[PDB]
């Protein structure tokens, strides 16, 4: 539908902005209240310190060419953070398949292959491993992790010039994830943020260039851009302080003017999704609740709004937690977690220099009565001085040489508080089953929290990520298109077409993590003894056929070239028809 | 609590020299967590969760299929989240409460090709609520050791009027009329003064929604009674039921 | 009270040392010239005898190290978590009389017992609720999707209406016994390659389903699609003959 | 009976921690200057022997 802005005080323009409007303002209030904690994990990050009296004149003392002390914070802190970053790369991250999945009654294990392509095509093309670093790293650094995804459809123009001549691109079309920030979305304030999924609206902020913005108009998604486009202003409030320079802001200096026309810059706007009774709302006629898509530009008008046509009633949206206690709270990263301790691991050297920056010089007593003091202020390979021993030398004893026995203490309780190497006596000894022997590798142990936390990362947020990929995925491309991209892969025609309500009720198919990997080598043993003993026996070889069973052991083994090896080699084009009815 | 002299420490970090600020041990919380992660690696680390074993050797062939079952149910119901905030709980408080129903998800969708609605089925299955422990009404008579064999089991909930007017249809609801209304309640037992940040929201603040209605949530309590119908009066038999 | 008694000890243990551990002289300021005093160069001569003394000054408290252990050792004693009372002995666990995973990560750490006592207490339970419940809500034309191909007959998926009320042929089991069908698969393997000789083990037995099920319980499910026949979907369903 | 022995001893034992172990000073303080008794820096000198 369209909504076209006029000045009346009723108009489905306005009342829907007031609405949401007043669905905007009770959100900003949850992020609001918890502007400042959050703030404050950045500066620890940046590990930043307020500087002391002491230290100005210090930093002077080397321009002029001497040393002295200049104020620091210890990083022990720092270092469990990007360690178990590092560890959480390793098992999510940097593996094959990276997505990988398994089916329970096998009509899905025929398609299983297929599916796996289309995500290792999709992921490995769109992007998206830059996107997810983000996302473990910021849940970790403040405590709260999100991230998006959305469809994209990627057309452009260009030129050949050869009698000026203009070509258009297909391009890239494939899912693709957006990190949000997070001091820009918007939840819904009365559920708990693990639950989102249930909550009324959730919202984030964006910019869109004024040429991309018309490039969309004439794509149909966008409307009132005439007049929406002579705003060209914006504001900004929220920002963290030590990370950017003050000139990250340009004092707007933003927008570029054409020559000959207009300027090109940025329109703030905001996205909500919001779950509405289309009569109530005015919008149209139905007493069920429905989920639709509207977007406002700034505070005063409305670009785009439309309906929801994929098949999951789940918000296109996923969030991780570092804590674990699944109820209303406040989450708390592990920085914030050990930053009082790490006060004290701070001071304590802190003392210790700066005591010994005061005491620790050698110097001499003495009467200058009786010496010859000319003498004195030499330096030679022998000299007498004259008369008897009156100087003496300065005991100093530093009694801050104990503070070693304290340091370790101090960072054994924060390995305590933290857990990232505790000691827990190293006897964890065996693997174990998942009890297929197909189904287990990298068993590691629970090394205490980091494996936990990791099978909580999975279960929240990392599996919806796939479920909605899937889905995706599986829904919105086209069998004109599927043919595409998973080429050779469809042996047959039962591999792709699936029912429109088969993907909806996510039936002969489930997504699994690497927390239990799938090895497909002894998979691939395992059937090639199977196959081995079915040669003998000839009551087997005519219960099954033998070519088959070789092409897919060999495609699973991952050749993928076999089926390419035959004397026939049918392939391409001959595909699609290939499919029956 | 803070000490007297932890306000001159936080002032002289404000202004940035070092001084020490009072903590406790954590030695203590580290057992809960290490303990809670064996329990986790012991029961929830592997996929099956459920394993099923026949004696008669009917139900051996019965065996996979009642697995597979199992094994869709549990993975499409996202219940392992619930088992680990039930788990906690139980270590954390000493008690752990969790439920569970039946789902039916039924949703309305359109297609916008000439402005046509079309239904999907959704997804049908069992899902796990868990409870807070001031939320759950047990039956003091009979302890908790044996709380299956006591009378009534109640818990509280908020419901939606969005949601539970459209359950209006589906026939599972009534009396929404004079109910729907009322749309302020209280909280009796709202927890520590640490974890939520005072009210997260100050009232029970609902959105207006224009053309005359109003979207927030209404309090509600379950309660599992074993009765006999022709002492309560609902129907005709001697024997109790539940 | 044992994490209490910590967070005292440390903390007079840091309370004491930050009110006296300093570097400080004494002298009789008559004597020496202020001036020098004060300079810091790497050699200076303040003038006259040496009157200056350093301030002896000792930490009591160094000792709080050996009690810390020990409360430490104590709050082990009081939780359990790893108490060493259990001590050090080899393995060697044979739990249960057939091929059902024997031997453990841990034989006994004094937290499986609890974990144990939780499984029998709250796991079982709920999974006898999953296991009824999914059982008896779920209908026959839908329990043909879900699980597909691995109904291989009525005979798996049929159950009379008292059969799930009694919990006849079957019974859940968790994972502190778990159940290997890797071990399983390989005796079927065995008892198949020698019924394959004395042929009058294979005039009492068909062989080929032998073959699928082992592949099925191995974990390949796909063997029954590898076949030429290829039979699946709603001819499942018309399988059926009441 | 074992466990009361057990139990005391510690008892004993934090309780005389309790009483005796403080870091104090003895002095005549008609001697020092006082204010400067009091006060903490990296480096002071408080006057007199």
Same mark, same amino acid.
């Given at each position: 539908?369209?909504?076209?802005?006029?000045?009346?005080?009723?108009?489905?323009?306005?009342?829907?902005?007031?609405?949401?409007?007043?669905?905007?303002?009770?959100?900003?209030?949850?992020?609001?209240?918890?502007?400042?904690?959050?703030?404050?994990?950045?500066?620890?990050?940046?590990?930043?310190?307020?500087?002391?009296? &002491?230290? &100005?004149? #210090?930093?002077?003392?080397?321009?002029?060419? +001497?040393?002295?002390?200049?104020?620091?914070? *210890? !990083?022990?802190?720092?270092?469990?953070?990007?360690?178990?970053?590092?560890?959480?790369?390793?098992?999510?991250?940097?593996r094959d398949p990276i997505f990988q999945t398994d089916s329970l009654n096998g009509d899905g294990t025929e398609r299983e292959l297929a599916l796996e392509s289309m995500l290792q095509?999709q992921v490995?093309?769109?992007?998206?491993?830059?996107?997810?670093?983000?996302?473990?790293?910021?849940?970790?650094?403040?405590?709260?992790?999100?991230?998006?995804?959305?469809?994209?459809?990627?057309?452009?123009?260009?030129?050949?010039?050869?009698?000026?001549?203009?070509?258009?691109?297909?391009?890239?079309?494939?899912?693709?994830?957006?990190?949000?920030? =997070?001091?820009?979305?918007? !939840? %819904?304030?009365? =559920?708990?943020?693990?639950?989102?999924?249930?909550?009324?609206?959730?919202?984030?902020?964006?910019?869109?260039?004024?040429?991309?913005? $018309?490039?969309?108009?004439?794509?149909? $998604?966008?409307?009132?851009?005439?007049?929406?486009?002579?705003?060209?202003?914006?504001?900004?409030?929220?920002?963290?302080?030590?990370? !950017?320079?003050?000139?990250?802001?340009?004092?707007?200096? %933003?927008?570029?003017?054409?020559?000959?026309? &207009?300027?090109?810059?940025?329109?703030?706007?905001?996205?909500?999704?919001?779950?509405?009774?289309?009569? +109530?709302?005015?919008?149209?006629?139905?007493?069920?609740?429905? *989920?639709?898509?509207?977007?406002?530009?700034? &505070?005063?008008?409305?670009?785009?709004?439309?309906?929801?046509?994929?098949? @999951? +009633?789940?918000?296109?949206?996923?969030?991780?937690?570092?804590?674990?206690?699944?109820?209303?709270?406040?989450?708390?990263?592990?920085?914030?977690?050990?930053?009082? *301790?790490?006060?004290?691991?701070?001071?304590?050297?802190?003392?210790?220099?700066?005591? $010994?920056?005061?005491?620790?010089?050698?110097?001499?007593?003495? @009467?200058?009565?009786?010496?010859?003091?000319?003498?004195?202020?030499?330096?030679?390979?022998?000299?007498?001085?004259?008369?008897?021993?009156?100087?003496?030398?300065?005991?100093?004893?530093?009694?801050? /040489?104990?503070?070693?026995?304290?340091?370790?203490?101090?960072?054994?309780?924060?390995?305590?508080?933290?857990?990232?190497? @505790?000691?827990?006596?190293?006897?964890?000894?065996?693997?174990?089953?998942?009890?297929?022997?197909e189904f287990?590798?990298?068993?590691?142990?629970?090394?205490?929290?980091?494996?936990?936390?990791?099978?909580?990362?999975?279960?929240?947020?990392f599996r919806?990520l796939a479920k909605s990929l899937i889905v995706?995925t599986q829904?919105?491309?086209? =069998?004109?298109?599927? =043919?595409?991209?998973a080429?050779?892969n469809?042996?047959?025609?039962?591999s792709?077409?699936v029912? !429109?309500?088969?993907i909806?009720?996510q039936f002969d198919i489930m997504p699994v993590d690497g927390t239990l990997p799938v090895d497909r *080598?002894?998979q691939?043993?395992?059937?090639?003894?199977?196959?081995?003993?079915?040669?003998?026996?000839?009551?087997?070889?005519?219960?099954?056929?033998?070519? +088959?069973?070789?092409?897919?052991?060999?495609?699973l /083994?991952?050749?993928?070239?076999?089926?390419?090896?035959?004397?026939?080699?049918?392939?391409?084009?001959?595909?699609?028809?290939?499919?029956? #009815?």
């Amino acid at each position: 539908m369209e909504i076209l802005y006029t000045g009346a005080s009723e108009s489905l323009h306005s009342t829907i902005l007031k609405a949401l409007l007043e669905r905007i303002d009770l959100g900003d209030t949850f992020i609001s209240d918890n502007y400042t904690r959050w703030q404050a994990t950045e500066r620890y990050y940046m590990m930043y310190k307020i500087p002391n009296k &002491k230290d &100005k004149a #210090a930093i002077e003392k080397w321009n002029k060419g +001497d040393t002295d002390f200049k104020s620091l914070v *210890m !990083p022990y802190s720092y270092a469990q953070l990007m360690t178990a970053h590092a560890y959480m790369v390793n098992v999510f991250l940097n593996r094959d398949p990276i997505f990988q999945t398994d089916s329970l009654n096998g009509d899905g294990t025929e398609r299983e292959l297929a599916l796996e392509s289309m995500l290792q095509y999709q992921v490995k093309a769109g992007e998206m491993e830059p996107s997810l670093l983000v996302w473990f790293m910021d849940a970790l650094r403040y405590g709260v992790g999100v991230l998006g995804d959305y469809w994209e459809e990627h057309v452009f123009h260009q030129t050949v010039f050869e009698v000026k001549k203009t070509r258009v691109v297909k391009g890239y079309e494939g899912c693709k994830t957006f990190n949000v920030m =997070v001091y820009d979305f918007i !939840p %819904d304030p009365r =559920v708990a943020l693990c639950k989102y999924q249930e909550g009324e609206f959730f919202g984030r902020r964006l910019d869109l260039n004024v040429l991309d913005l $018309k490039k969309g108009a004439k794509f149909g $998604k966008y409307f009132n851009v005439e007049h929406a486009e002579a705003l060209v202003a914006a504001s900004k409030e929220e920002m963290y302080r030590r990370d !950017p320079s003050i000139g990250q802001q340009r004092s707007l200096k %933003d927008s570029t003017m054409t020559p000959k026309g &207009k300027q090109v810059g940025d329109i703030s706007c905001v996205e909500i999704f919001v779950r509405l009774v289309p009569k +109530d709302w005015g919008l149209g006629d139905s007493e069920f609740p429905e *989920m639709w898509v509207f977007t406002v530009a700034d &505070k005063k008008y409305i670009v785009a709004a439309e309906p929801v046509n994929t098949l @999951d +009633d789940k918000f296109p949206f996923h969030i991780l937690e570092c804590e674990i206690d699944g109820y209303m709270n406040k989450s708390r990263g592990l920085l914030e977690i050990s930053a009082p *301790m790490n006060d004290i691991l701070t001071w304590l050297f802190d003392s210790h220099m700066y005591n $010994k920056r005061q005491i620790m010089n050698n110097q001499f007593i003495g @009467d200058p009565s009786a010496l010859v003091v000319k003498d004195v202020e030499s330096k030679e390979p022998g000299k007498f001085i004259r008369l008897r021993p009156i100087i003496s030398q300065l005991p100093v004893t530093d009694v801050t /040489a104990q503070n070693i026995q304290d340091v370790q203490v101090v960072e054994r309780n924060m390995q305590r508080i933290v857990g990232v190497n @505790d000691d827990v006596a190293g006897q964890s000894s065996p693997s174990s089953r998942r009890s297929a022997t197909e189904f287990r590798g990298t068993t590691s142990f629970a090394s205490s929290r980091l494996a936990n936390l990791a099978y909580f990362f999975s279960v929240t947020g990392f599996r919806s990520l796939a479920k909605s990929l899937i889905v995706k995925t599986q829904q919105l491309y086209t =069998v004109e298109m599927k =043919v595409k991209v998973a080429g050779d892969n469809i042996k047959g025609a039962q591999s792709i077409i699936v029912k !429109p309500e088969d993907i909806s009720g996510q039936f002969d198919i489930m997504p699994v993590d690497g927390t239990l990997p799938v090895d497909r *080598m002894a998979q691939a043993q395992f059937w090639m003894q199977i196959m081995s003993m079915v040669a003998g026996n000839p009551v087997l070889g005519a219960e099954y056929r033998l070519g +088959d069973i070789f092409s897919y052991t060999a495609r699973l /083994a991952g050749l993928k070239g076999i089926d390419k090896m035959k004397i026939r080699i049918l392939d391409d084009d001959q595909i699609l028809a290939l499919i029956l #009815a």
